[PDB]
Paper text:
Autolysins are peptidoglycan-degrading enzymes that generally reorganize the cell wall during cell division but kill bacteria by bacteriolysis when applied from outside the bacterial cell. We surveyed the genome of [name] strain 630 and identified two virtually identical autolysin genes, [name] and cdCwlT, with a lysozyme-like domain and endopeptidase domain. Since the protein encoded by CD03720 has been designated as CdCwlT, the homologous protein encoded by CD33800 was herein named [name]. Both proteins have a lysozyme-like domain and endopeptidase domain belonging to the NlpC/P60 family. Endopeptidase domains belong to the NlpC/P60 family, which cleave the γ-D-glutamyl-meso-diaminopimelic acid bond in peptidoglycans, are widely distributed among bacterial lineages, and are considered to play biologically significant roles.
The structure of CdCwlT33800CD2 was successfully elucidated and refined to an Rcryst of 0.184 (Rfree of 0.215) with a good chemical geometry using 1.45 Å resolution data. There are two molecules, Mol-A and Mol-B, in an asymmetric unit, related by non-crystallographic twofold symmetry. The structures of the two molecules are almost identical within root-mean-square deviations of the main-chain atoms of 0.42 Å, and the structural description here concentrates on Mol-A, giving a relatively clear electron density to the whole polypeptide chain. CdCwlT33800CD2 was spherical with five helices and eight β-strands. A large β-sheet comprising six antiparallel β-strands (B3, B4, B5, B6, B7, and B8) was noted at the center of the molecule. An α-bundle-like structure with three helices (H1, H2, and H3) and a small β-sheet formed by B1 and B2 were located on one side of a large β-sheet, while two helices (H4 and H5) were present on the opposite side. A large substrate-binding groove was detected at the center of the molecule, and a large β-sheet formed the bottom of the groove. The catalytic residues Cys242 and His296 were located at the center of the groove, facing each other, and Cys242 was oxidized to cysteic acid. The B1–B2 and B6–B7 loops formed the sidewall of the substrate-binding groove, while the B4–B5 loop formed another sidewall. The electron density of the B4–B5 loop of Mol-A was poor, while that of Mol-B was invisible in the final electron density map, suggesting that the B4–B5 loop was in dynamic motion.
Residue numbers in the entry: 212 to 334
Write the structure that this text describes.
Amino acid sequence: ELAQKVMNEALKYQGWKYVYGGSNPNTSFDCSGLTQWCYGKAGISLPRTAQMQYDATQHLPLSQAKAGDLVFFHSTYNAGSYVTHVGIYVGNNQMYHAGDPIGYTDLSSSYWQQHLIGAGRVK
């Protein structure tokens, strides 16, 4: 149920431009702004940053992940925190994320595999 609620919201922003600092439809979204907003619509309260969201979830490999789990990554840009990116797992090795434009990407790629930290299940 969670996945369908989060993604019904997230799909409204498919193709939108990434905006740094964005956390609502009025501004558009950054990676963890998209997840915070969409999970919020589904009744889950998440913290604002990708790192904070990582630390609020229970972790599991991508092979065990289910749609509606989050997926986290390291070393995607020059950051103080270990976690540098988050997106939404939607099954079949795909994630939906911001992302520029916002939308789907395939996690099977070497790039995502090598930046992967793991998946996280929300509380």
